[PDB]
């Protein structure tokens, strides 16, 4: 019984000591707003936090920080006692003591710098037996105490003073290093990190549970993403904060040694896991331990490879080990490896975008302090392909930078230096900017998998095909009963045409990011250099990375391009079927219909498309697009002008009504021509912030008309054709 | 284990992982432990990575056990009792050498199970525990195609996992020690299988799948004139073997059939391999097209080699004129109507044995620019041409189609199909698919009644199309009549 307990769940707040409960929470143990809390660990040890009441951020659900974690031994999926303490208690008298551990390099006294200016307007408490980390000399310290007052009683009080007895105490090996890599420490990646954690926790916080069942548990976890996403880290941090024996063989020292005894480490490697039960092994690489596809070059390659299918083949129950890979592509690992039992389970992490980048920032920039006007939210912004490794060395080069613009106009060169400056180490906007123009980026040319931030604001009219895109997309992952009840099958996926700039790909990115789905961009050139070059396997890769993205979309736009290339609607003798759509048929009609993974054709000719893709199965849902109206004009107008600065007197509905043939990029280009002039003179009258009648003016004598009549019945002609109200178009039947 | 012979297993990668030199002295030790104890038997996981004889060719190391195997089987008198089995995943990975009589005579191909095949194994890997009441298997299994014995396995295992971790998330029995008075209530939901299926991964999934469908002739309306026909060129071969020798006349070894798109021409080929009990092989036209860009012309070969080998089989070939189209057609450029992959067909079509019982079904919407040489008496003499319904039959096409949607009982089909005049199949069932899109959308708009009225199919006879318009209907007679010629003498009554 005993319903009090709270299970351990994940923090999404990135904050130091803050406990959210829920409304009836607090009259089950009449606690007030700010109270101090006790919590029974084990071996009879206690800590103390901090609540925060809260009805608004969570409903019931505990966030328990990783600051408690190594004070009381608990880890995820444990259980734990709550307990109000109303008691009221003020120290005055407290003991340090630092052990003679990491006190290298810090010369003076750090108390009276870092911890004077931080505890003020806190009224943090404090326990004996707590291991708490501060902020400062680029870096984070740790303290114990082992002889004060008697707990608790201890309260942060200015009434207290400093002392030093210069006899340390030697450390001991009871508890682990905080410091190493946690749960907290990797940002940017939510849902690939709840499949591990719904994976490993099974066999490994709980190994007496397959014991007595018959379950089969997953051996094999493979790892995806290009080099430097974090891969090494996931697995250190999975098997730091679970209780498991963590072992890591690179790869290349396996490979490194003699041919004879590598066999036999690889062996031993897999041997001494077992009997540190729970145990975990990571390969920190395997494309380059298993290159079975075009390498092929002497038994003593191929002798480690079936040395390793025999050791994980092998791997009955009898204790429990999970064997982690990582790889960069799955084009490089041997497919003897990925049969059931040696690697059955793989997943893919891919590059972070905005919100993720921003969300691992953080975690490279707290062990220093940043200035007042310097944000990392508008950083991570306009950068896109950056990977997970390269924020981290980014930051690291701006560090140098900041200390060499600061100690070259003070020169504080001498024998010795004192620890008190080094923490007046701040990171200014132009050092950030320096450095990040000055990386150079490792992926850059790969298939950008991100959920983009536009909304249905951003597209402006179009209201009749936007429900249309929402009752195709949104309704057969929402309500499979109706749609299974009625029994007709959902649609695979929608190709929409229209003349070009009128928001093909903003109605795409707006579907994926309604729906809370992943998104895939395929342009033009990105199908034109499959043809070109005869390469075409690229195009499975697509689809199957796609697949195991899911949820996501697909985007293929203006899938004419080949058809453009090779003459159109007559060209050579050939007619309108090419290899690339061909591939893409067979790949669109192989996949599962049940799986959340939508297609979306974009064209702009559909004269020259190929018809075997218009038949009922593969892409029967056709939606036309035609040109905005006056009254939609106005909204796409309204809707790209958000972010310049317009003025009040600036009237767009006479602007929109002025435009009889324009589609939407040519109200785009308008206001970023006029946005060109109002820069201009600004840059110019400094040898006003805003944008006035007189720069739309002149901008509007340069306005382009790409869609003429010549491309408008063009439309009409193919509309009718699809539609064909003639013959028994609107007749009332009698029935 | 259920004949009672000594059971000896070996994977192969253990046989390759040890040092040069006593591999071949472990697998020389492995065959002759196997004779003295009799009765035993000889199993190999995989073959493909053992006598890699096609593509490797490094090392002698590697020829060695090849040799060794060789030797091992090839001196295999009788003496004792003993059978030597080995698996692979492909016949694209086995050395020729080892497919000599007397080491690999007899080759068994064990295929993708379908609906019928899953729903047999689903018990196995769920007998030890137990489900709902309102949680079945049978539908569970039927929508999903692509997958493998194993994967049934690996997404039960996972599936019983959430279901521990959906129940003990809000009960938290987390304490010392644990009884075995809880795990008995672990009982599986639907929603539990439907995440579990839904976020599966599946291992082989553009493969030709192989099944037998579970269409029946109740599913295609009319064309009662053409059911006679397939029956009579399939089933009598096969049923009265003795009537056709005696007479003196081979049978027909394949029958193509022709006419506009969307008429049946792909259930009239499931049709007659269901009724036969037989199995049945779909190579679409993109299949088709992929192996004529890529010039990647073998793949053809596989093909018949594997419809040869799962006899009883009916071939399909669907939309054969994909290449012609895709070369320019009637005209196209400068060359005929003969291409390569058509070319590769039939040669194996000619070389085919005639007395096992594999048929093939040719499908076409252009008989004009297809390869007159198909048309030969000996691969494809027997031509059907499907012409559009009739009235007659539309009301069957639209009452077989709306059987799985539920109709009420004042929605008139016979005026429905009378209406329609040139209306292929698929635009009587494009119909009922947008009708069915209206009642769904607005049965989820008036929960913020489960039938269809007449206003469904009012609103969904608006959008109607016609594909097949009268441009394409007299290509269809001018073919008929230049292929039967009644002209000249026709229909004359003879004296004798
Ligand atoms: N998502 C991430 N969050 C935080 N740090 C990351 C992330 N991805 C990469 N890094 C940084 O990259 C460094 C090394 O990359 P790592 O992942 O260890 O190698 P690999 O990418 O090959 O697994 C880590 O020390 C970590 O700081
Ligand atoms: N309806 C619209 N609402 C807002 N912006 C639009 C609209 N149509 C076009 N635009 C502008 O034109 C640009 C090109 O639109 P795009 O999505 O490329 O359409 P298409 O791909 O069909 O040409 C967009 O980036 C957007 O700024
Ligand atoms: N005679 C018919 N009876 C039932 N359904 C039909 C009939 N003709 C066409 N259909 C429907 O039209 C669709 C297309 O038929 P299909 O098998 O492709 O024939 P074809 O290949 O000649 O177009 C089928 O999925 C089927 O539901």
């Known amino acids: 019984n005993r319903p009090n307990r709270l299970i351990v769940d994940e923090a999404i707040n990135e904050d130091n000591s803050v406990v959210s409960l829920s409304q009836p929470k607090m009259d089950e143990l009449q606690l007030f707003r700010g109270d101090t809390v006790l919590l029974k660990g084990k071996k009879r040890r206690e800590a103390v936090c901090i609540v925060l009441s809260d009805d608004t951020c969570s409903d019931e659900k505990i966030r328990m920080n990783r600051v408690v974690r190594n004070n009381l031994r608990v880890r995820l999926g444990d259980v734990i006692s709550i307990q109000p303490c109303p008691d009221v ?101 939510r849902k690939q990190l709840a499949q591990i954690k719904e994976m490993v926790e099974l066999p490994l916080r709980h190994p007496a549970l397959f014991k007595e069942i018959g379950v089969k548990p997953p051996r094999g976890i493979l790892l995806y993403g290009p080099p430097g996403t974090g891969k090494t880290l996931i697995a250190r941090a999975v098997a730091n904060e679970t209780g498991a024996f963590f072992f890591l063989i690179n790869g290349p020292e396996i490979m490194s040694k003699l041919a004879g005894e590598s066999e036999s480490n690889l062996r031993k490697a897999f041997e001494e896991a077992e009997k540190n039960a729970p145990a975990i092994i990571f390969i920190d690489e395997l494309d380059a331990i298993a290159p079975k596809r075009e390498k092929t070059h002497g038994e003593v390659e191929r002798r480690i490879v079936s040395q390793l299918l025999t050791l994980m083949d092998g791997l009955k129950q009898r204790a429990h080990v999970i064997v982690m890979a990582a790889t960069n592509r799955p084009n490089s690992i ?127 009219g179009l209201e009749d095909v936007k429900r249309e895109l929402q009752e195709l997309v949104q309704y057969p992952v929402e309500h499979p009963d109706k749609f299974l009840k009625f029994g007709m099958t959902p649609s695979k996926g929608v190709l929409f045409y229209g003349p070009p700039g009128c928001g093909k790909t903003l109605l795409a990115k707006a579907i994926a990011n309604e729906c809370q789905a992943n998104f895939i961009s395929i342009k033009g050139p990105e199908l034109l250099t499959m043809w070109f070059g005869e390469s075409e396997a690229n195009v499975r890769e697509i689809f199957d990375k796609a697949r195991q993205a899911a949820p996501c979309v697909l985007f293929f736009d203006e899938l004419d391009s080949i058809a453009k290339a090779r003459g159109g609607n007559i060209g050579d003798g ?72 317009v003025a009040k007197d600036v009237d767009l509905e006479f602007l929109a009504k002025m435009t009889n043939g324009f589609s939407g990029a040519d109200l785009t280009e308008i206001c970023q021509r006029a946005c060109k002039l109002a820069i201009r003179e600004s840059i110019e009258s400094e040898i006003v912030p805003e944008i006035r009648r007189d720069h739309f003016e002149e901008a509007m004598r340069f306005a382009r008309r790409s869609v003429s009549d010549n491309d408008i019945r063009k439309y009409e002609m193919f509309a009718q054709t699809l539609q064909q109200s003639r013959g028994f178009g609107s007749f009332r039947f009698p029935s």
């Open 574 to 645: 050939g007619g309108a079927a090419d290899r690339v759509i061909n591939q893409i048929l067979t790949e669109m009609d192989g996949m599962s219909t049940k799986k959340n993974v939508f297609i979306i054709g974009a064209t702009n000719r559909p004269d020259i498309i190929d018809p075997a893709i218009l038949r009922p199965g593969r892409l029967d849902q056709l939606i036309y697009i035609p040109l905005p109206d006056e009254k939609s004009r106005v909204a796409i107008l309204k809707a790209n002008l958000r972010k310049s600065p």
């Open 89 to 189: 208690k003020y120290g005055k008298r407290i003991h340090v003591l630092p052990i003679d551990d990491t006190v290298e390099g810090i010369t003076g006294n750090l108390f009276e710098v870092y911890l004077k200016p931080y505890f003020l307007e806190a009224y943090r408490p404090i326990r004996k037996g707590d291991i708490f980390l501060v902020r400062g000399g680029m870096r984070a310290v740790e303290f114990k105490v082992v002889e004060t007052d008697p707990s608790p009683y201890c309260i942060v009080a200015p009434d207290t003073v400093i002392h030093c007895e210069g006899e340390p105490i030697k450390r001991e090996d009871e508890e682990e290093s905080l410091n190493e890599v946690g749960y907290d420490d990797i940002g940017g990646c």
């Open 334 to 460: 041997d497919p003897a490896l990925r049969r059931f039992g040696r690697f059955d389970r793989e997943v893919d992490i891919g590059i972070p975008d905005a919100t993720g980048r921003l969300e691992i920032l953080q975690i490279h920039t707290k062990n220093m302090k940043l200035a007042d006007d310097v944000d990392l939210e508008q950083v991570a912004n306009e950068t896109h392909g950056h990977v997970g490794a390269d924020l981290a060395a980014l930051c690291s080069e701006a560090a140098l930078q900041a200390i060499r613009k600061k100690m070259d106009l003070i020169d504080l060169e001498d024998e010795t230096i004192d620890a008190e400056v080094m923490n007046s180490l701040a990171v200014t906007m132009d050092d950030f900017r320096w450095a990040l123009s000055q990386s150079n980026p490792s992926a850059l040319r790969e298939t950008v998998v991100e959920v983009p931030q536009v909304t249905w604001e951003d597209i402006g």
